[PDB]
Structure formats: structure tokens, C-alpha cells
């Protein structure tokens, strides 16, 4: 099992984009091999399938539906296979790009279960899934209202460890660059304001996330400025970009 697939991976890498020719042979067998494989090989196959997908890239579209079905079937709360699959998820996103939003809804049930019940030490499988969500990009448009509440609970939970809280905040920063966040301003800002009390360590990261959100909202953020200012003074939060951005918004100058 181990040697056969290591060869095929090196072959596809050595070929380049000419490997696309061999796709119809490899994939149907390779997928059925993942189905009937047992124990350790499963994890290894998923690792090597990721490599395959990274080379095939857009050409993997016909077999993508089966791959998702495979993932859906063999996704378990087992920490080991989750980290493995999350890596394979990140590679599918770069491969399909815009076409990934067709298959994401099948994966959502497992992603929502990851946040609900994550027993990973320090929730590093959650942190990994946050790093994946950053890659999702404009795919998340139609499903952001579903994914966001779990993420919001993550960085507002005090029981949760600080590393996992930083990871959630940095994710919102990235998603702010690409997605629209006007609709869900309140659902986020109120946990953030609350986070600026209970912990001074997140004050830096969180404030950077806020400025990005402010930049995206523009005049729509004016509403919250009174309320947030009250929390900022209470703990002397002095952000350079944020004070500039507020000044720019109130003045009305556009840049």
C-alpha cells in the first residue's frame, strides 16, 4: 500500500500538467482503495490524495463529488483523522477556487461539530480549521451566517485558551479583507467589546481586527463609535490606525 502510492505521487509531480492524461485511470481506483482500506493506511492515503489534488488542481472537478462523500463518511471525532482531513480541505480550496462553494455545504455539518465538541488539547484542531477558513475566501459568502456564530463563541469563551482565541480573531481579520460584514456587525462587535474587558492580552490582536472591520464598514460603523469609545477609555486602548480611521470617518474624507 505505502510504496505504490508514493510512486504515483512522484510520477505526477515529475510529469507536471501532462499528468492530467492519467486522471481517468488513477482516480476511480484510488477512491475505491480509500473505501476498502483500513486502519493507518486511511490517514496515509488522505495525505497522498492531497498531494495528487495539488497537482491535478482544476481538473479534479469530475471526481470531487465522490471525494466529499468519502470525507463525509470517514469524518469522525477522532483527533488524528480530523487534522489529516483539514489539510486535505485546504488543498481542495486552492485547486477548485471559485468552484469550491458547490461542495462546501456538505462539509459544513462536520465543521459545526468541530467547534461544538472539540476535545483537542488547546483546541489546536479548531485553530487549524480557522487557518483553513481563511483560505475559503469568497466561497464563504452564501454560508457565512452559518459558520460565523461558532467562530464568535470561540473567541468569547473565557474557558477557552488564549492561543485559540487569538486564532479566531486573526481569522476575522482575513475574512474582512474579502467578505462583506455589514449584516453581522452587531453579532461580532458585542463579543469583542466584552473581550476587551475580560482579558488584556487579546487587546492588541482584537483591536487590529476591529480596525479592519471599521475600514470595511465605513460610515456604517458610526453607530457603534459611542459605545466602543466607552470601553476603550476604561482600559486606555490607544490604537494608531483606529484613531486615524475614526477621525477620517467623522470628517467624511474618503481615502
Amino acid at each position: 500500500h505505502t510504496m505504490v502510492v508514493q510512486a504515483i505521487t512522484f510520477i505526477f509531480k515529475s510529469l507536471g500538467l501532462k499528468c492530467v492524461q492519467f486522471l481517468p485511470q488513477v482516480m476511480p481506483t484510488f477512491l475505491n482503495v480509500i473505501r476498502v482500506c483500513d486502519g493507518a493506511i486511511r490517514e496515509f492515503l488522505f495525505q497522498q490524495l492531497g498531494m495528487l489534488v495539488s497537482f491535478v488542481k482544476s481538473h479534479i472537478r469530475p471526481y470531487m463529488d465522490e471525494i466529499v462523500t468519502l470525507m463525509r463518511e470517514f469524518w469522525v471525532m477522532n483527533t488524528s483523522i480530523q487534522s489529516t482531513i483539514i489539510l486535505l480541505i485546504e488543498q481542495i480550496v486552492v485547486a477548485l477556487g471559485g468552484e469550491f462553494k458547490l461542495y462546501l455545504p456538505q462539509l459544513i455539518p462536520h465543521m459545526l461539530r468541530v467547534f461544538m465538541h472539540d476535545n483537542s488539547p488547546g483546541r489546536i484542531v479548531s485553530i487549524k480549521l480557522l487557518a483553513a477558513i481563511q483560505l475559503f475566501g469568497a466561497n464563504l459568502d452564501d454560508y457565512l451566517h452559518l459558520l460565523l456564530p461558532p467562530i464568535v463563541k470561540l473567541f468569547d469563551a473565557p474557558e477557552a485558551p488564549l492561543p485559540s482565541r487569538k486564532a479566531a480573531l486573526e481569522t476575522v481579520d482575513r475574512l474582512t479583507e474579502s467578505l462583506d460584514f455589514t449584516d453581522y456587525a452587531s453579532r461580532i462587535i458585542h463579543p469583542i467589546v466584552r473581550t476587551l474587558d475580560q482579558s488584556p492580552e487579546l487587546r492588541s490582536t482584537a483591536m487590529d481586527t476591529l480596525s479592519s472591520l471599521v475600514f470595511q464598514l465605513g460610515k456604517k460603523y458610526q453607530i457603534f463609535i459611542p459605545m466602543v469609545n466607552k470601553v476603550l477609555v476604561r482600559h486606555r486602548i490607544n490604537h494608531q490606525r483606529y484613531d486615524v480611521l475614526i477621525c477620517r470617518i467623522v470628517k467624511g474624507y474618503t481615502l
Binding site: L17, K18, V20, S58, H59
Partner: protein, 48 residues
């Protein structure tokens, strides 16, 4: 009120000039029947 005319503001709404697109250049590097080497098109690809 005072018997005084209201000061007319600087009305800048008037268009400075009217442009006219006199001619159009359609440079088509379609290379119909040939595929560019840089991009390895998929078998279905995009034909239209």
C-alpha cells in the same frame, strides 16, 4: 429681511467638454484552432 439679492453660488454642474469616440480598434488575438502554450486548457475548457 434685508432688501438684498441672494448670492449665487459657483454653479460648476456644467460639463467642461463633450468627448466623441470617433473610431474603434478590435485587435483579436483569438488564434482559433490553436492553444496558447502557457495555459494547458482542460478538455471541456471554455469554448464560447
Amino acid at each position: 429681511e434685508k432688501i438684498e439679492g441672494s448670492k449665487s453660488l459657483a454653479q460648476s454642474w456644467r460639463m467642461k467638454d463633450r468627448m466623441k469616440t470617433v473610431s474603434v480598434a478590435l485587435v483579436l488575438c483569438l488564434n482559433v484552432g490553436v492553444d496558447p502554450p502557457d495555459v494547458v486548457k482542460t478538455t471541456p475548457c471554455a469554448r464560447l
